[PDB]
Every structure is written in structure tokens, then in C-alpha cells.
Amino acid sequence: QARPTVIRWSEGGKEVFISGSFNNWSTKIPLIKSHNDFVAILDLPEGEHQYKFFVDGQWVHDPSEPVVTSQLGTINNLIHVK
Numbered sequence: 001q002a003r004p005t006v007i008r009w010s011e012g013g014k015e016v017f018i019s020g021s022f023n024n025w026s027t028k029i030p031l032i033k034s035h036n037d038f039v040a041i042l043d044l045p046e047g048e049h050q051y052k053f054f055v056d057g058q059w060v061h062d063p064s065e066p067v068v069t070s071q072l073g074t075i076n077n078l079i080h081v082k
Contacts, residue, residue: 002043003081007031009038009062013055018042020051020076028054050076 009016009031016038017028022045031038031053050068053060061067061077068078 002045004041005044005079005081007040007042007051007079009053009055010036010064011055011060011062012036013038015056017054018051019054020049022049022051044079044081046081048078048080050078052076 007018009018016031016033018031018040019025019028022042029040029042031040050070052074053062059074061075065077065079067075070076
């Protein structure tokens with residue numbers, strides 16, 4: 001069973017999307033604006049996923065969450081889902 005998981009982006013921007021390894025980087029999922037934040041709920045399998053944000057057309061990671069180096073040599077965020 002995948003776990004509905006809240007993802008929050010607090011760094012601003014006009015439009016915010018997330019992509020990640022949970023679907024082999026195949027889609028850009030919008031986050032919904034809520035006051036100073038943007039928010040999504042993703043259905044994530046147990047385990048770990050790498051992810052990155054696409055904010056006003058630029059790939060960026062969340063500085064408030066853990067990061068890992070991908071084989072692309074870019075910094076992705078990492079989430080562990082129990």
C-alpha cells in the first residue's frame with residue numbers, strides 16, 4: 001500500500017512542481033499554493049525516493065530536507081517512507 005505523504009516547499013517561487021524516482025522521473029506534479037508554502041500529497045511506496053523541484057523553470061532542491069548525490073551528479077532530496 002502506498003502512503004499518502006505531504007511534501008512542502010517553503011522557498012517561494014511563482015510556480016512549483018515536483019518530480020522524483022517514485023515514477024522514474026516521468027511527470028511534473030504541481031504543488032498547490034498555501035500562504036507562504038506550496039504543498040502536494042504524493043502516494044509513495046514504503047522505502048526511499050529521490051525527488052527534486054521544478055520552480056519557475058529551474059531544478060532546485062529543498063534546503064530543509066536531506067540530500068543525496070545522484071549518478072547525474074546533481075543534488076536530489078531523499079525521503080524515507082516507513
